[PDB]
Amino acid sequence: THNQWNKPSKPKTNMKHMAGAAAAGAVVGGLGGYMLGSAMSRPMMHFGNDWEDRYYRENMNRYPNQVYYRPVDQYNNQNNFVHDCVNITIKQHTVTTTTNFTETDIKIMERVVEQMCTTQYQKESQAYYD
Amino acid sequence: THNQWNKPSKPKTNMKHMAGAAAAGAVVGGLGGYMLGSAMSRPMMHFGNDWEDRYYRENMNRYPNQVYYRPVDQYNNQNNFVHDCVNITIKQHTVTTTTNFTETDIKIMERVVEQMCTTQYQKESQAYYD
Amino acid sequence: THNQWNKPSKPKTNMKHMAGAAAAGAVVGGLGGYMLGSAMSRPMMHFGNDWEDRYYRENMNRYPNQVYYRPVDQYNNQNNFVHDCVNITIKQHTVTTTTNFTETDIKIMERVVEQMCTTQYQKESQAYYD
């Protein structure tokens, strides 16, 4: 004879996002790829009594992994920025009190802020006078 | 004879998003890809009594993985920005008190803010006088 | 005869994101790749009684791993920035009090902030006078 009792008392299980793809305030975006943040799983579990006599299983499988990885990548620009440019403060004040002459004031690119947490492949900059 | 009892008391299970694709305030967007944040799973579970005598299963499968990965990627621009440019403060004040002459004031790009958390492949900039 | 009792008292399990891909405020983005932050797992577990007599399993598998890794990568620009440019303070003040002459003031690129946490492959910069 066989007897199998199973009397759990108030069991609690949390299988949220089990064997799945979860993304929370993230980026799963690439220029290239074949498997980015995916799930291909075959998990097995038991939580009670189990009993097996004479089985055959999981024998003579043939699943070799064969890959030819030949990409060409040239003159690209990729950047991954996380938590950059935090708590930046810039202050630039000016105070002037003034009181038969000739004055001239010529200025270029005065009090300029540029390129805070930017990415580029190429740039040029010409700032001159004649 | 065979007997199988199963008397759980108030069991709690959370299988939200199990073996699925979940995205919460995220981006799953790429230029290229074959599997981005997907789920291809075959999970098995039992939560009570189990009993099996003489079965044959999961034998002589043939599922080899064969891939030819040959992309061409040239002169692209990709960027992944997460939590950038937080808590930025810029302050630029000016105070002037003034009291037979010739004055001249020529300024270019005065008090300019530029390119805060931008991306680019190329740029040029000409700021000059004649 | 066979007897199997299973009487757990208030068991608690946390299988959140088990055998899956999870991303929380991260980037899983690359220029190239074949498996980036993926899951290919076959975990087995039991949490109660178990009993097995005469089984055959997991025999004569053939799953060799064969890869030809031949990529070409030329003139690329990639950068991974995490927690850069934190708590930056810049202060540049100016105070002037003034009271038959000829004045001339010529300035270029005066009080400039540039290139805070930027990436580049190439740049040029010309700042001159004539």
In order of their start, the domains of chain C are 31-130 (1.10.790.10)
Listed residue (A82, B18, B68, B120) closest to C84, CA to CA: A82
Residue among B108, B117, B122 whose CB faces A85 most closely: B117
Distance CA C27, CA B50 (A): 43
Is residue A101 within 8 A of residue B100, CB to CB? The reply is no
Q: Do A61 and B61 lie within an 8 Å CB cutoff?
A: yes
Is residue A30 within 8 A of residue B30, CB to CB? The reply is yes
Q: Is C31 on the interface with B (CB under 8 A)?
A: yes
Residue among C20, C21, C25 whose CB faces B82 most closely: C25
Is residue B35 within 8 A of residue A36, CB to CB? The reply is yes
- Cβ-in-10-Å burial (0-12, 13-18, 19+) of B104 comes to exposed
Distance CA C14, CA B18 (A): 13
B-chain CB neighbours of A124 within 8 Å are 123-125
C-chain CB neighbours of A69 within 8 Å are 34, 67-71
- For chain A, the residue count is 130
Burial C52-83 (b: 16+ CB within 10 A, else e): eeeeeeeeeeeeeeeeeeeeeeeebbbbebee
Distance CA C57, CA A44 (A): 14
Q: Do A38 and B43 lie within an 8 Å CB cutoff?
A: no
B-contacting chains (≥3 CB pairs under 8 Å)? A, C
Reduced to 3 DSSP states, what percent helix, strand and coil does chain A have, rounded to the nearest 5? 0, 45, 55
Is residue B93 within 8 A of residue A93, CB to CB? The reply is yes
Smallest CA–CA distance, residue C87 to chain B, in Å, is 10
Helix (H) or strand (E) segment spanning residue A57: strand A56-57
Helix (H, G, I), strand (E, B) or coil at B35: coil
Determination technique used: cryo-EM
Distance CA B27, CA B101 (A): 63
Q: Which two tokens stand for residue C95?
A: 């105070």
DSSP per-residue codes, C19-41: TSEEEES-B---SS-S-BS-B--
* C-alpha angle B30-B28-B72 in degrees, rounded to nearest 5: 15
Q: Do B23 and A23 lie within an 8 Å CB cutoff?
A: yes
DSSP B65: E
